[PDB]
Write a protein that holds these residues in place. Structure first.
Motif, PDB file in Angstrom:
ATOM      1  N   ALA A 155      -7.064  11.492   7.185  1.00 26.02           N
ATOM      2  CA  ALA A 155      -5.963  10.845   6.490  1.00 26.02           C
ATOM      3  C   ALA A 155      -4.643  11.491   6.880  1.00 26.02           C
ATOM      4  O   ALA A 155      -4.598  12.656   7.283  1.00 26.02           O
ATOM      5  CB  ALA A 155      -6.145  10.920   4.971  1.00 26.02           C
ATOM      6  N   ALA A 156      -3.568  10.715   6.762  1.00 24.63           N
ATOM      7  CA  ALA A 156      -2.228  11.199   7.051  1.00 24.63           C
ATOM      8  C   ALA A 156      -1.227  10.426   6.207  1.00 24.63           C
ATOM      9  O   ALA A 156      -1.465   9.273   5.838  1.00 24.63           O
ATOM     10  CB  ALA A 156      -1.887  11.059   8.537  1.00 24.63           C
ATOM     11  N   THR A 157      -0.102  11.072   5.906  1.00 27.35           N
ATOM     12  CA  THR A 157       0.955  10.475   5.100  1.00 27.35           C
ATOM     13  C   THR A 157       2.304  10.971   5.604  1.00 27.35           C
ATOM     14  O   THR A 157       2.397  11.661   6.623  1.00 27.35           O
ATOM     15  CB  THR A 157       0.779  10.810   3.613  1.00 27.35           C
ATOM     16  OG1 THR A 157       0.586  12.221   3.454  1.00 27.35           O
ATOM     17  CG2 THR A 157      -0.407  10.072   3.032  1.00 27.35           C
ATOM     18  N   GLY A 158       3.360  10.597   4.884  1.00 29.66           N
ATOM     19  CA  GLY A 158       4.687  11.112   5.141  1.00 29.66           C
ATOM     20  C   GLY A 158       5.377  10.458   6.324  1.00 29.66           C
ATOM     21  O   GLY A 158       4.908   9.483   6.915  1.00 29.66           O
ATOM     22  N   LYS A 159       6.539  11.022   6.661  1.00 27.40           N
ATOM     23  CA  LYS A 159       7.320  10.502   7.779  1.00 27.40           C
ATOM     24  C   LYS A 159       6.561  10.636   9.091  1.00 27.40           C
ATOM     25  O   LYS A 159       6.527   9.699   9.897  1.00 27.40           O
ATOM     26  CB  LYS A 159       8.666  11.225   7.856  1.00 27.40           C
ATOM     27  CG  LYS A 159       8.561  12.740   7.984  1.00 27.40           C
ATOM     28  CD  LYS A 159       9.919  13.414   7.844  1.00 27.40           C
ATOM     29  CE  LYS A 159      10.359  13.492   6.390  1.00 27.40           C
ATOM     30  NZ  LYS A 159      11.699  14.124   6.243  1.00 27.40           N
TER      31      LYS A 159
END
Lengths: 223, 227, 231, 242, 122, 237, 234, 234, 247
Positions: free
Chosen positions: G162-166
């Motif tokens: 998983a990954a998030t953010g800018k």
């Protein structure tokens, strides 16, 4: 700013509360005059109306009286609450309600109904007159939808109020107030003719609604 | 010769659409003059530039009301940055500001860009449509609205005022009234679609460019520690 | 005006906010199918992941509401899971109050009645999901009942939901001993109607029998596809 | 860069950019409509003076009450929407009386103003009222812990210890002169004249015993509202000195 | 309702109960079943919410109670003591009867305005 | 607060709550237009510089230090009727104007014409002091130097005055303009204590007063009680 | 269409296309946060954060962004700070309550559902706004490792990475390659997680992991030599 | 322009994901007067610049004591500071009665964090417009917490909040290596703090009236130095 | 949040906005009609279904409130379904549990109308988008047929129709009604009238018909105690309707 009670206008007054006053100005005229030992209340009055089941001056107690101007429906309910308080005070306490107390309570009810955006404030201004129990000093008070109550020597509220409050201001002298039942009644009648029902309240719970005022009208008209 | 007149309406779409047109075609448009700002809310600000239309070197500020002219297209464009001071002064605006200019440059036709609010006579019909186009060649039904428009008449809303006074300039020959049913919010994309449709009804615009001033629409900076 | 943002009648006499909820059921872009056997009910549903990182095991729109009742939701899963917990609790309360297992149809009525609240209350929005309860009632036998945000609930001998429900349903209308056979029958028409071949990862299956409702695992689904290939 | 309406002022809970709460600021605009009230704190007692602002000559100016007694050594002067004030005064009276019942000690006016401000603070979390109070009151009292002191309680819920304060209409003029004229050695007698002198400039009409009334806080006498006769003498002395 | 003149006594008149005779201290001898039966429904509802909290988490009770408050507070009908139609659905009492439903149970203080003030706490 | 009222939806922001000149919203005729009566007996050449301000900046010009005195007032009237007049002040060789800007009572149309008359009869060293809700920080400006970024701008009366100094008849006059950030409707703008410090100590550079004495006088008038400070003296810690 | 004017000023409102735009806007708030990733291993999970150092005044040991919901659960979020910490505490309350009642650590799938209901409950009424944080959380239980990622919409799924953010598109692209290349040991992922953060990117690297073998099922941070080794690999 | 449509309340997300109504609350602190906080290993100090409404008015109280071991300063809206400070004090006293433990400084700052973040999620209420600087000393030792109205509490060696607080922050960063090593010297630590706040001044100079100082440590229960007692540190 | 402003308010023309819109929803709804015969009452409607795969038996629009009373609707089914559930409940709390017998038709209609009316002045709920043709029998008033609208106004009708084909069907019922109609004749008229209104296919599966007529002891479920006689409301099966159509 106009469409809510909880919003102050930039200049610093609540428009919605003001708009309730114009409703009073649209109502029927009411008058009140304080004598040395008496108070007189005059009011402004179709062909097929049943005149025997109608008095704009409703007494809140044996010694207190309450005239009003503005929306009649609101007044009829404001009067009822005052009547209950008068007896409740006479029950929880022994002495009858002070005239200043009743107007303070009535004004509180009007003030209370201004404390929410889901309630329409009473568009009625009351003109409370009477004598304190076992006292001979006449007392006349006026209440407004905003909840402010004031003591007046003579006041008029409703249709044609400024014109009638100007006639009283020049003809009524606080240092030379009328000292007879006839004198105050004549002033009240003369006050109403500038545009008849007259009620006189006297100390010790002696309230009488005058009849045959035509004599005063004929006397005042000639002069 | 044609002139486009944006109206201050819901979402400022006519004003925003003008910004899309002028800056997207900045290579063609240029500043012509500033119309009198007497009847508008007076407005002074710096010069807006594409992400400059003002060719004069010494100019430093933009007025409340200005006119831009396209040499290639022979097209005029008014940019109104403030609303009229009062509703009744629109009669003053058209008679004393617009009409003299129309005869001044011999404008053949005037195109009025407007937007209507759904929540605000019930002239709205076939509401599934979102655009409209009224035409006039030299509640009322003076304007000839084309099919596939969200209205076919004019209510108490503003367009009645301008059309009457204009009806009541020899060069002027026709009138067009383009409208868009819209709502409040960030109408930057809505105005672009409105400009696309009116163009469809032109190069046409291949790449739309925002004004630099639009960068500050949402504020100045985002320098704080709550993300 | 306000009719667009709250569930009140428009001048045309229609609730726009409720109708926009139907269009939200197709956001997930998933279509289902439920058919009835002689003694069991089977429901099919696509499992478009589609991301490689996303774990297909947790991507399930089929919920085991009760021992005998299972439901398949078309639409966003956050609304689906909320609906499941409601149905997962209504069934238990019914058993407590009335002393017998929740019937399939009554559960749809309760959930549909709850949806009716959202279509009438201004401050409550419609859930935005379509629930397809499948079970084998001890009285009516296999049964399929489908609920929609408008508050309607209808029993079906065979139903399909999703963007391409019309394509699927038309095939069933033309067509119209163990649960493994109906599973193959349901899968075959899904392949025929949609034209897309299926694998274990792209498919999820739920079966309702007399005893209980269960969802086939990934390996179990692969077996049914293998059996289809034998044809 | 277009001109559009801004609604950071209509709401009471709506912050504007830079963090200004306008509805509270508009509440202060209501105070400026109210009658002028003056208060000077010094040795030998505090003094309060209020313009009565008779709406009409028929109005009973002898019954206009902008100064109210909260405790036998505490007095309050109010300006603005008097209807809202009655709610605050009633609460203040109850708190002062309640404190005596619970501690057998006169309530410290610094604590009393804290209690009152807790009520005006109630438009948010202490909520009981929809809008902030449209009345700003001026508390003058003497407690035997800090001496003769004067407190100004804004509707925003903040109170300040003021040597001399003027509120209501013409407060800006009154405050400017109080800065020129107030000093530590100001005796009570000249303070009473000073209060009347300040009222002279900012009161739109003639200054008279009928439209102005004074009050003072003294340890021996407590809170007392001056009779019309005494105010006439002080006004007479004031114009003689001028 | 406390007396306006004195905020420490019940308003004997506005509180129409047969005089001040039903004094506060005397409402202590009660039927053994009165207290348990009066708030029986409340106890069951709260107990039900506790089980939801234990199993389904705090989210489910929050959703249940928020829906009920939405229904109750948006429903004001001073001419009917009957429960709202949607209240029954949420409480799951749309196909049930009870003595509280069969037996739902003055010139002075029964007016509409009395309920308006209580509804808004004005 | 369990829910937000369904009915509470703002009116579209494209329209401002400006005062209604005439009740006849259905007027289909050229509306009457205001007039401005500049007093002709003012000896303008006696004054080398002129200052144009709105009332919210009055504390910057203390009566106590500058020896301010009146010379008269401008009169404006409008039939439909309205009548407003605005005093003219001066100190030394400086001519000063304060319009008493208001959002509810005074429509912007009055300010527009006054801007016309002021500029049509002054066309001295023009000093324009103002406020704007669209500027992040204080801005120093002149005819040949612009500091505003594209997003920012000036509206209201000060925009009316600046418009005439830039465009329209009698354009090109040399002027020095100072605008401080503020918020609120016309005539009720609020300025932060930081702005007030930056404001007196900068206008003193041009007006030429003893900066410390000038600041000492101004703060007392700013902070003691004023429309510009408002609740900021007690609303904040 | 990404604005949805008219249907975007209120929550719990369906647009004509069926979208609730307020939730979509909350997603954009997530996309502005510091990129955070989570890798699921054969024996555990790994969390990494690009904590952007703001000033030296912050206490380094008390400035920790990888929250620990429970002894066996690790949580990392991107988006609004008030919502992220509000959700963590509520999730912390649920984990404690489950342990209190059933005397066992809360399963990760059950923990995710409890959070999902709470997050989704704020998309139902107009008096509340959706949480503006996408929370990556995971841990180890009887069924092994689990990595979950709930969105502002309340939707959550199990993830292998998983990954998030800018820094989301770049991290996700590289994260996909890692899964494709090694379809990991708790040791190896820590090095890989550090690599992805550096590729995604003044910032400091914060890493934590929880595995059955190397931490007997507990969640611990990366410190000392292990940290430096991960930085050297990156 | 577009910000006006989405800044109505703390419930509407802007199309770019920004939550304006709570950003303004953070900006409300700049209206308040500058306060500076710094700590050493054993001592924590608060320095505040009070303001008066008028020259005839007493300077507003800006430093409060929750107990003998910790206290706080205020910056921003007065009404919010009144609510938060006393609410925190209601929690210092509550724990002792039932449990007889000192409520730790870290717990004090975090119980308040939940209070602020609720107001940013619900309609009607507004985010608090007050920032706090909490300093205390417990078993663990010195503590300095900066609470922002957005529910963000950060452990800090030193910080400054209020109008023109950037200048004080820059000085503290430039001198972090110094005042941390000022251990066992309460007098010198205060002088560093007084110097730190001095950089934020524009016109007003330090005086015994406006200036207030607080300090707490192992040998110093929370003491507030105001009035003539502050002359030496100037 | 102590209050919620009313959804239904008067327009400047004196008309209630949501009420008129609610009537439009009924108008756009499927047609349903009722006929009052000399010895019975008939209520009929036709079932529109999303797909033919739907089970027609579950699309019950005509429903039983009391054994002697029945209702049919045109408009939004969910609103009618909720109303029937409350109407049945109210029939027991208000009347049966107090008087020991089922309420008469006029009283039950009044209580249903009261439920619909309280939604016409409320800040949370829109008015019900249905109009119910309530048919029943009373020992004293005899057979009756009532139509209740979203506004809560109920009128007794000899014969009426609601929905899309209301005007066309009502005029057709006008020319084919009399005081001497027999229940068998009324059913024939009802099936006819419904045939012009129905679009598409017309049989016993797309049509459901219920009648209030003579008692049905076979439907009582028990024998004995003859004072307790059967019900009067009977929902004709698809088999019976098909036989009627061919005649």
């Amino acid at each position: 700013y106009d469409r809510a009670l909880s919003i102050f206008s930039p200049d610093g007054h609540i428009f919605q509360v003001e708009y309730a006053l114009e409703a009073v100005k649209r109502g029927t005229c009411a008058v009140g005059v304080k004598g040395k030992n008496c108070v007189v209340l005059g009011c402004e009055r179709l062909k097929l109306q049943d005149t025997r089941i109608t008095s704009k001056v409703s007494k809140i107690d044996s010694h207190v009286v309450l005239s009003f101007s503005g929306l009649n429906a609101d007044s009829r309910i404001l009067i009822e609450k005052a009547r209950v308080e008068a007896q409740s005070h006479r029950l929880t306490l022994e002495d009858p309600v002070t005239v200043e107390y009743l107007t303070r309570y009535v004004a509180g009810v009007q003030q209370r109904y201004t404390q929410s955006g889901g309630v329409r404030p009473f568009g009625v201004s009351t003109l409370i007159a009477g004598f304190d129990p076992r006292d001979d000093e006449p007392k006349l008070y006026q209440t407004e939808p905003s909840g402010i109550y004031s003591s007046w020597s003579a006041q008029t509220i409703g249709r044609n109020s400024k014109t009638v409050r100007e006639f009283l201001e020049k003809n009524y002298d606080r240092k030379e107030p009328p000292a007879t039942v006839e004198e105050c009644v004549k002033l009240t009648v003369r006050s109403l003719l500038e545009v008849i029902e007259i009620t006189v309240v006297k100390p010790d719970s002696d309230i009488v609604a005058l009849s045959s005022e035509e004599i005063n009208q004929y006397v005042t008209q000639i002069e | 010769s044609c002139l486009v007149l944006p109206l201050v309406s819901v979402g400022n779409i006519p004003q925003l659409s003008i910004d899309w047109l002028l800056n997207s075609q900045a290579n063609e448009w240029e500043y012509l003059e500033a119309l009198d700002s007497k009847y508008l809310v007076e407005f002074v600000g710096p010069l807006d530039r594409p992400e400059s239309l003002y060719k004069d070197a010494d100019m430093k500020y933009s007025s409340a009301l200005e006119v831009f002219y396209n040499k290639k297209r022979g097209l005029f464009a008014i940019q109104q940055r403030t609303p009229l001071v009062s509703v009744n002064y629109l009669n003053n605006f058209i008679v004393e500001i617009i009409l003299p200019f129309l005869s001044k440059y011999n404008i053949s036709e005037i195109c009025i860009w407007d937007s209507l609010y759904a929540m605000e006579n019930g002239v709205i019909v076939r509401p599934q449509e979102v655009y409209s186009l009224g035409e006039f060649y030299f509640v009322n039904n003076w304007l000839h609205f084309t099919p596939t428009s969200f209205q076919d008449k004019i209510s108490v809303d503003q367009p009645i005022f301008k059309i009457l006074f204009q009806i009541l300039p020899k060069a002027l020959r026709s009138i067009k009234y383009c409208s868009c049913l819209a709502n409040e919010g960030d109408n930057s994309l809505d105005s672009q679609q409105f400009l696309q449709w009116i163009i469809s009804q032109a190069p046409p615009i291949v790449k739309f460019v925002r004004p630099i001033s639009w960068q500050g629409a949402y504020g100045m900076a985002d320098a704080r520690d709550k993300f | 005006g306000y009719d667009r943002h709250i569930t009140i009648f428009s001048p045309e006499g229609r609730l726009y906010q409720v109708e926009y909820a139907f269009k939200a059921t197709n956001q997930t872009n998933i279509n289902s199918l439920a058919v009835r056997g002689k003694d069991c009910t089977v429901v099919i549903s696509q499992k478009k992941v589609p991301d490689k990182l996303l774990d297909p095991t947790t991507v399930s729109y089929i919920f085991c509401i009760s021992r005998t009742i299972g439901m398949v939701v078309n639409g966003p899963i956050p609304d689906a899971r909320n609906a499941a917990l409601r149905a997962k609790a209504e069934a238990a309360e019914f058993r407590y109050k009335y002393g017998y297992d929740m019937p399939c149809d009554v559960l749809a009525k309760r959930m549909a009645n709850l949806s009716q609240i959202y279509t009438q209350r201004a401050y409550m929005r419609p859930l935005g999901v379509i629930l397809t309860f499948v079970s084998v009632d001890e009285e009516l036998g296999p049964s399929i009942y489908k609920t929609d945000p408008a508050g309607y609930y209808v029993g079906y001998k065979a139903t399909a939901t999703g963007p391409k429900q019309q394509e699927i349903t038309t095939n069933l209308e033309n067509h119209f001993e163990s649960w493994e056979k109906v599973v193959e029958f349901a899968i075959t028409h899904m392949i025929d109607a949609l034209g897309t071949e299926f694998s274990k990862n792209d498919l999820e299956v739920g079966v309702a029998t007399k005893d209980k409702f269960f969802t086939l695992s990934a390996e179990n689904i692969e077996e049914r596809l293998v059996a289809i290939a034998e044809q | 860069m277009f001109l559009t309406r801004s609604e950071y002022d209509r709401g009471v809970s709506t912050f504007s950019p830079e963090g200004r709460l306008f509805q509270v600021e508009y509440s202060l605009e209501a105070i400026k409509l109210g009658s002028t009230a003056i208060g000077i704190a010094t040795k030998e007692g505090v003094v309060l003076g209020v313009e009565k602002r008779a709406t009409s000559p028929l109005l009973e100016s002898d019954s206009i009450e902008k100064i109210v007694e909260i405790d036998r050594h505490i007095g309050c002067a109010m300006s603005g929407l008097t209807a809202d004030a009655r709610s605050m005064i009633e609460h203040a009276r109850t708190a002062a009386v309640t404190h005596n019942l619970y501690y057998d000690e006169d309530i410290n006016v610094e604590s009393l103003t804290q209690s009152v401000c807790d009520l005006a603070l109630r438009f948010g979390e202490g909520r009981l009222m929809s809008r902030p109070f449209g009345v700003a009151l001026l508390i003058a009292g003497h407690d035997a812990d800090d001496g003769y002191q004067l407190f100004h309680a804004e509707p925003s819920g903040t109170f300040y210890r003021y040597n001399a304060k003027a509120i209501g209409s013409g407060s800006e003029g009154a405050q400017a002169e109080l800065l020129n004229e107030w000093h530590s050695s100001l005796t009570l007698k000249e303070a009473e004249l000073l209060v009347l002198k300040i009222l002279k400039q900012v009161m739109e009409e003639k200054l008279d015993e009928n439209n102005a009334q004074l009050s003072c806080i003294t340890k021996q006498d407590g809170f007392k509202i001056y009779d019309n006769e005494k105010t006439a003498e002080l006004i007479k002395e004031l114009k003689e000195k001028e | 309702v406390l007396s306006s003149a004195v905020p420490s006594l019940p308003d004997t008149l506005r509180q129409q109960e047969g005089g001040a005779v039903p004094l506060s201290t005397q409402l202590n001898d009660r039927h053994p079943l009165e207290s348990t039966l009066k708030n029986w429904e409340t106890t069951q509802r709260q107990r039900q919410m506790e089980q939801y909290r234990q199993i389904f988490g705090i989210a489910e009770p929050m959703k249940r109670t928020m829906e009920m408050e939405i229904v109750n507070r948006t429903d004001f009908n001073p001419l009917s003591t009957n429960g709202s139609i949607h209240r029954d659905i949420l409480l799951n009492k749309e196909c049930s009867i009870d003595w509280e439903d069969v037996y739902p149970g003055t010139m002075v203080g029964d007016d509409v305005h009395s309920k308006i003030e209580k509804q808004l706490g004005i | 607060m369990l829910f937000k009222q369904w009915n509470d939806l703002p009116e579209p922001k494209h329209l401002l709550d400006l005062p209604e000149i005439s009740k006849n919203l259905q007027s289909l005729e050229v509306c009457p237009v205001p007039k401005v009566e500049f007093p002709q007996d003012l000896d303008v050449p006696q004054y080398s510089t002129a200052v144009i301000t709105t009332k919210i900046m009055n504390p910057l010009f203390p009566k106590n230090l500058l020896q301010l005195t009146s010379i008269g007032e401008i009169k404006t009237t409008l039939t439909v009727v309205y009548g407003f007049s605005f005093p003219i002040y001066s100190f030394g060789k400086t001519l000063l104007f304060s319009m008493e800007e208001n959002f509810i009572s005074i429509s912007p149309i009055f300010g527009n014409m006054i801007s016309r008359s002021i500029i049509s009869q002054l066309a001295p060293d023009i000093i324009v002091i103002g406020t704007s809700d669209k500027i992040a920080s204080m801005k120093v400006m002149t005819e040949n130097e612009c500091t505003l970024q594209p997003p920012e701008f000036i509206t209201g009366f000060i925009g009316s005055v600046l418009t005439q100094l830039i465009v329209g008849p009698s354009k090109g006059l040399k002027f020095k303009c100072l605008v401080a950030p503020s918020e609120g409707p016309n005539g009720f703008e609020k300025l932060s204590l930081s702005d007030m410090g930056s404001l007196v100590d900068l206008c003193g550079q041009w007006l030429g007063f003893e900066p410390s004495r000038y600041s000492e006088e101004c703060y007392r008038l700013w902070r003691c009680d004023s429309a510009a400070i408002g609740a900021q003296s007690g609303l904040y810690i | 269409t990404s604005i949805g004017t008219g249907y975007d000023l209120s929550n719990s409102v369906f647009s004509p296309d069926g979208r609730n735009f307020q939730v979509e806007y909350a997603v954009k708030a997530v996309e502005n946060g510091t990129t955070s990733i989570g890798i699921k291993c054969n024996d555990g999970v790994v969390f990494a954060v690009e904590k952007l150092i703001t000033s030296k005044l912050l206490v380094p040991q008390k400035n920790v962004k990888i929250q620990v919901v429970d002894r066996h659960i690790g949580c990392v979020y991107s988006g609004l700070i008030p919502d992220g910490r509000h959700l963590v505490n509520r999730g912390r309350e649920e984990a404690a309550s489950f342990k209190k009642l059933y005397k066992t650590p809360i399963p990760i799938p059950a923990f995710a559902d409890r959070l999902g209901q709470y997050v989704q409950a704020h998309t139902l009424y107009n008096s509340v706004r959706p949480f503006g944080v996408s929370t990556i959380f995971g841990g180890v239980d009887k069924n092994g490792a689990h990595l979950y990622m709930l969105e502002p919409s309340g939707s959550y799924w199990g993830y292998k990475g998983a990954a998030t953010g800018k820094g989301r598109q770049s991290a996700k692209a590289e994260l996909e390659k890692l899964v494709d290349h090694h379809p990991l040991s708790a040791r190896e992922a820590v090095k890989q997680a550090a690599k992805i953060i550096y590729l995604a990117h003044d910032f400091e690297l914060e890493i934590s992991w929880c595995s059955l073998s190397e931490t007997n099922g507990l969640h611990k941070f990366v410190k000392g030599d292990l940290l430096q080794e991960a930085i050297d690999f990156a | 322009m577009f910000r006006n449509n989405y800044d109505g309340d703390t419930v509407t997300f802007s199309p770019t994901g920004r939550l304006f109504q709570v950003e303004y609350a953070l900006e409300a602190i700049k209206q308040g007067s500058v306060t500076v906080g710094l700590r050493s290993n054993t001592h924590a100090v608060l320095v505040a610049l009070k303001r008066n409404a008028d020259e005839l008015s007493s300077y507003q109280k800006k430093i409060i004591k929750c107990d003998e071991h910790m206290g706080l300063s205020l910056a921003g809206l007065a009404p919010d500071a009144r609510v938060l400070s006393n609410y925190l004090r209601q929690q210092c006293n509550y724990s002792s009665l039932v449990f007889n433990r000192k409520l730790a400084v870290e717990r004090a700052g975090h119980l308040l964090c939940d209070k602020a973040q609720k107001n940013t999620q619900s309609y009607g209420g507004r985010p608090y417009g007050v920032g706090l600087l909490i300093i205390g000393y417990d078993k663990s030792g010195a503590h300095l917490l900066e609470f922002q109205p957005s529910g963000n509490v950060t452990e800090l060696y030193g910080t400054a909040i209020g109008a023109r607080s950037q200048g004080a922050k820059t000085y503290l960063e430039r001198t972090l290596d110094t005042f941390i090593k000022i251990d066992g010297n309460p007098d010198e630590l205060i002088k560093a703090g007084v110097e730190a706040i001095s950089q934020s001044l524009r016109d007003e100079s330090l005086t015994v009236d406006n200036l207030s100082i607080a300090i707490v440590g192992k040998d110093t229960p929370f003491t507030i130095y105001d009035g003539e007692a502050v002359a030496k540190y100037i | 949040d102590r209050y919620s402003f009313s959804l239904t308010t008067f327009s400047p023309s004196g008309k209630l906005g949501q009420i008129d819109y609610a009537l439009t929803a009924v108008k756009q709804g499927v047609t349903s009609l009722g006929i009052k015969a000399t010895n019975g009452v008939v209520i009929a409607t036709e079932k529109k279904s999303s797909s033919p795969l739907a089970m027609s038996e579950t699309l019950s629009k005509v429903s039983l409130l009391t054994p002697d009373i029945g209702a049919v609707y045109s408009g939004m089914g969910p609103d009618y379904r909720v109303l029937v559930d409350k109407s049945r409940k109210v029939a027991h709390t208000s009347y049966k549990r107090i008087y020991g017998e089922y309420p008469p038709t006029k009283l039950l209609v009044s209580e249903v109308a009261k439920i619909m009316q309280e939604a016409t002045q409320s800040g949370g709920v829109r008015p019900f988008g249905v109009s119910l043709l309530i048919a029943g029998h009373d020992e004293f008033n005899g057979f009756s047929l009532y139509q209740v609208d979203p506004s809560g106004s109920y009128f007794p009708w000899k014969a009426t129709a609601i929905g899309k084909g209301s005007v066309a069907a009502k005029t057709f019922l006008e020319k084919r009604w009399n005081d001497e109609l027999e229940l068998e004749d009324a059913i024939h008229i009802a099936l006819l009238t419904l045939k012009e209104s129905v679009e598409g296919e017309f049989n016993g599966d797309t049509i459901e018909l219920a009648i209030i007529g003579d008692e049905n002891p076979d439907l009582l479920g028990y024998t004995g105690i003859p004072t307790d006689k059967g019900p009067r409301f009977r929902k004709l099966t698809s088999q019976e309707i098909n036989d009627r159509l061919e005649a």
